[PDB]
């Protein structure tokens, strides 16, 4: 039952982007065996900065990369760009209300990348727009992270018990 | 008894859908109490034609197992290379030559994913069919990923691997 | 308590050596008896002189740390790519900027190894002193697959990791 | 205390290949921690062919590929030869009178590899030399094992208890 919080940060000048892996759910079958029934995905917290070393994490942004969305990711080419829409209210009510937009994009002229979460939330009156520039060797440390959390995200750690 | 976990990954497309399910490797106990791997774990895949919106028929299911050398192929591949298997799921019993299974895979014409393609020839019951699934380009490293990291489970290297620690616990040297 | 491993990694060369160990992330407990990361794990490089023939002096050894985004800078590098590393011990402290670490990491000149050489200015001991050993391609191999391994590690995941399944065993969804 | 035999086979024409993994070994410290005192390997089984699917393993050659040698293999090209000599009795008495020499290297014109382990021991009059034919798939389980293992080897899963 040990509970473990393992965000992992990266501080800039003007922003902080915060990754915490969420583990996949399971459903109980009759048989008393269990089924996974929900990927896990990574959960990306942005925040802009308020003063020297700090950020304002009432002020943040979130967007949950998927199992497929991890794996554009780790199969980029080292500058080619991406982008990912989601509505977190599809299939909902709210829906077409709430728009997300991430772009992950080499920098300019530069060995690194940036990611970029823009945000427009009717329901609460958000339009927002967090960027922040990360090295090559922290994007290396991401997709070392996300390569190796994939097969737990799918649950493969977890065949074989016996 | 240890917990039992059902951890099948699926790709939902217009006409067909696949899923693949990780299968463990087998081990005998020994007289010493020590365990022998009998069997490599393998996968196996299940492609089921969709009957109506995101719904599929898995009574019309067909499936194709992949060995661990199988998977060697896949992991190896170049990135646009083609690769094709050839099964006869009787090869050795008394059904043999009775029923013929290709798997394929290979790029997308002009484009940046892959296709499965299963074809099955099965003359125990006059049944020639055959089922197509396109596979993205981030689908595809998902599934790379996966093979990659079940490879050693297979082979049964992870029981090794973590056998390492306890095992010292009990027999490691003394200083004299 | 559970047991207490030392797995450092040496490599000893005719001038030099080095040792490579590995050190754990630290965590907190919270009230809610959940644990929260507070420290990321990072590697300790021991490099030592010759003492005569194949023995060092460790009471002459200089350190240095790498952290978790340096490692990042190794794995990431380029075939023949040249890195170098600034460190202050104290940085941040009372005795900040008396004391300058400058590791590099380079290919061998016209061959397929690699070196690392560590220089130490230690103004509050009057210290000025480098280390130098070579690496053979084989050696830096499996350090690139060490770091690559560690890498999660160091930042906790593993722990995350390796704790789904026994969580899914308490928290799971019932059927209706 | 639970012992796993996993030995991975590899069964040719002529030759068999069995690749076991060993554990490292440890020493008990003063203060009740452990200290990794040997690094772990692979042990490479070869056998002649004697009869359809059956080798004599009685006549089984053998070689320990060390770490550093699995770093050679790891980071081979794709059609790189290299070549191990080991004298199992380096730093003994009997020095000098067991030689062993295992060649990898690419096939030719092919895109497989050759395993081939030659033994001369005057010890016990043995002059043997075992080749094997791989298939570029089976020569790429092999890598990701090795791969795999790497780690394993040198005790690194193992820091980090607490
Ligand atoms: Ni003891
Ligand atoms: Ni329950």
Chains 1, 4 share one sequence.
Do not use: M
């Not at 829409?85 to 829906?95: L, N, T, V």
């Not at 991401?142 to 994939?150: E, G, K, R």
């Amino acid at each position: 039952p040990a509970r473990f919080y393992v965000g992992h940060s990266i501080y800039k000048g003007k922003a902080a982007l915060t990754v915490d892996p969420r583990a996949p759910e399971f459903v109980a079958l009759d048989s008393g065996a269990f089924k996974l029934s929900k990927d896990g995905f990574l959960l990306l917290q942005f925040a802009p900065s308020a003063g020297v070393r700090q950020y304002d994490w009432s002020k943040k942004q979130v967007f949950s990369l998927s199992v497929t969305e991890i794996g554009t990711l780790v199969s980029l080419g080292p500058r080619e760009s991406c982008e990912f829409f989601h509505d977190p209210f599809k299939g909902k009510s709210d829906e077409g209300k709430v728009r997300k937009v991430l772009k992950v994009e080499p920098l300019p002229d530069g060995s690194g990348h940036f990611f970029n979460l823009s945000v427009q939330n009717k329901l609460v009156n958000v339009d927002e727009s967090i960027y922040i520039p990360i090295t090559r060797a922290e994007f290396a440390v991401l997709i070392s992270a996300f390569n190796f959390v994939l097969p737990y995200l799918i649950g493969w750690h977890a065949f074989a018990n016996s």
